[PDB]
Amino acid sequence: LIIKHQMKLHLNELVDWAWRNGVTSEKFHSNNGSYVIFDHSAVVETYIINKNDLFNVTEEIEITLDKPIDYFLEKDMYGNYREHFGIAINDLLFLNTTVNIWLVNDDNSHILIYKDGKLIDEYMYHQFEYEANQNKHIYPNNKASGTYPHKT
Amino acid sequence: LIIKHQMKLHLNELVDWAWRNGVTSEKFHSNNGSYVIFDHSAVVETYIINKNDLFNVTEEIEITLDKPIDYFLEKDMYGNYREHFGIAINDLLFLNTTVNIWLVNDDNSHILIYKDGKLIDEYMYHQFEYEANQNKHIYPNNK
Amino acid sequence: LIIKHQMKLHLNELVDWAWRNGVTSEKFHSNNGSYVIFDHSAVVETYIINKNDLFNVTEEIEITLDKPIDYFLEKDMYGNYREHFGIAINDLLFLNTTVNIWLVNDDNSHILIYKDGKLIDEYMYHQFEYEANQNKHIYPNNK
Amino acid sequence: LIIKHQMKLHLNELVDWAWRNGVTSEKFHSNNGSYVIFDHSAVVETYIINKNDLFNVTEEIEITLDKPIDYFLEKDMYGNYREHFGIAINDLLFLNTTVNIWLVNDDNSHILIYKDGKLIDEYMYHQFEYEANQNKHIYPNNKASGTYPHKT
Amino acid sequence: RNKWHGVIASNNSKVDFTSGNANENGLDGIQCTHGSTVQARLSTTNGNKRNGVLAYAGDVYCQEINCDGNGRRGLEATRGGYVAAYGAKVSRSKDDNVLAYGSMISINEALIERAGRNGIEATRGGQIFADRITITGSGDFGILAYASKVFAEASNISGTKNEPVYATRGGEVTCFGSNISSNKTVYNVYNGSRIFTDKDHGYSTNVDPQTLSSKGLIILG
């Protein structure tokens, strides 16, 4: 169960993500045409990069029982709701009692991943990911934060 | 606020749902190619509808603080989760500390409807950006 | 009251800090000789900045009873120690028995800011000396 | 981890420090020119020594896990703060839980000595010693407490 | 960051820019020239040294194009161009926000703010469409006309410096249900130019309400 996740990151977030998920050599372009070049997992050359510049990066999050999940919500068969941070699903002491497990997406939106004793397949997960936060209005805000740097 | 949920119902559940939420004339299909036809809210034709056949139906639910909700889940600021049945959102005794409210969708799915004192449509979900104006600066060129 | 703290930040932390506390034009160096340059609050140049590279940056924090503090620690007269986040010193409910207040500096370091009812700059830290005037006495000489 | 500590002591404090940290033979000069001579760890000859006379002495305080520390503050991993007087760091029953240990300097100023399971090196300790009490204003008070003793 | 335009379509060519970015360029962010049409449904064209989008005798089609900080007219059409943008969000243009230059522009429900000059303008013929367009913080005028007609069945002009709506050398301003808010004279007419509006809100008028003159006629009814 591997899920593509495309996001836009500032320079600090992009550098952090690149160093955590090792990149040997790659050039990342930004919203405003600035670029940063990683060579041998070390920053080498950066163009004129202003604040609020957005870089597009796609990361794969894979949801499996054995690997840890950053934030999930578990419902016992008795009716108790608990939340667990950064532990695998199998790491629960008594997985026998657990009925449902929902991933949490930092938007306070729950996506069902574990029901009826088995993981949710990829396509039902896509359906639930669309379905969880339908009426999510994002604030519209645009600032150019740049101008053609050279004298032309 | 309109919430759209897709569900899978057998023939009996499909018939009950269709007659409960009036449908005049339309054809429902299933996985195995079997179909049922409603015409003027009457089951005119069925075509080899075995058991364990799942008809996929989309359902529209209007969500409003005054209107009661069949089954929802509320989360306070501290972390306590509770579930309520047949109670309007405004009816809750303690809305002061209620941070989030999801709607349990009978599939064990969860749909956010209430976030930080407002319905989810009214909330605006501010992004993040460092505060700064345009650079508007001339830089040397390396060419 | 101005508190100066020196810290070591990686590239991502350095960029976040520099853009958060606006820097117009200046060059930061690291341990391994790598450097980054901000010019008009833009990252113009970087020179081979590997991971686990520590840029040393000094930071100035203004401390005042009205201004809130990110993370501080308070010690009463009896001996109980507590920690508070995001609360101004004047905001504390029990300042009557609060004897000392240090500022936890995210490095687990501790900087004294409040001592015995006053900010640390206002306190005077009297030394010790036996009370007596000048001797002004003529003594015999051994020569 | 040996730290030099220069201080000014009155006659009583100087005598006490000398006898605790055995001095076989040495002459200590004061602020106002008076001197005290120790010979065979016994006071022999003292010039005209007035009250409030200050003698300069440097003592080495060494911070190690095995030797006792006069006053330190310990933070458990759970979040409890405790203070211990005159015991070594290793003398704690469960050093496993301890996260941070700060020395206390009688000015209510804490200096970090133990973090991340290891002692703080000498240079970081010097940095923290400078850093702990920056805005420490000492009361300015000057009294001569003397005059050229002889008739001249 | 290109020296010339960001994306250019010339000589009867089609280009699609559904959500792309044309920023920081040394000239017009998007330019159609001589019959070519680009499509920019949700693009972002901000910060350029020149116009956010230009239509040099070509068609431009947008839905919610974003513009900001461009060096000149945020949206511009000339020599027969046609810029259609139902919900364009232009802002902070050094010059005019959107200017029609002898051609047509269709911003039905655009929201445009903080222009360095006139909020909208139709100079030297041409027409500009509007349904509920929102002007805010204009430089000189919220609406301007030079022998050109501007239709705004409703509007929310505010924060304008000199005058909310201005008509000169002919040309109508069919701003009927506008929620204008400014201290100066609201409706202005000069050199035989008409204006049509409602009487529900009493707004200052340069000329007597519903009579002809040397200056154009107004119908406050």
Numbering used by the authors:
A (entry chain L), D (entry chain L): 1 to 152
B (entry chain K), C (entry chain K): 1 to 143
E (entry chain D): 389 to 609
Sentences from the paper on this structure:
Here, we report the structure of the complete virion of S. epidermidis–infecting phage Andhra, determined using high-resolution cryo–electron microscopy, allowing atomic modeling of 11 capsid and tail proteins. The overall structure of the Andhra virion follows that of other phages in this group, with an isometric head (capsid) around 500 Å in diameter (vertex to vertex), connected to a 400-Å-long, straight tail surrounded by 12 appendages. The head has icosahedral symmetry, with the tail attached to a portal structure located at 1 of the 12 fivefold vertices.
The Andhra portal consists of 12 copies of PP (gp17), arranged in a 150-Å-wide ring with C12 symmetry, with a 30-Å-wide central hole. The PP monomer consists of three domains: the wing (51 to 160 and 258 to 334), the stem (6 to 50, 161 to 186, and 234 to 257), and the clip (residues 187 to 233). A 128-residue insertion between amino acids 122 and 250 forms a twisted β-hairpin, creating a 150-Å-long tubular β barrel with an inner diameter of ≈32 Å that acts as a conduit for the DNA. The 12 appendages surrounding the tail correspond to trimers of RBP, the 609-residue product of ORF15 (gp15). The Andhra RBP consists of an N-terminal 36- to 38-residue loop followed by a 34- to 38-residue α-helical coiled-coil stem domain, connected to a 534-residue C-terminal β helix domain. Because the gp6 dimers appear to anchor the RBP trimers in place, we refer to this protein as the “RBP anchor” protein.
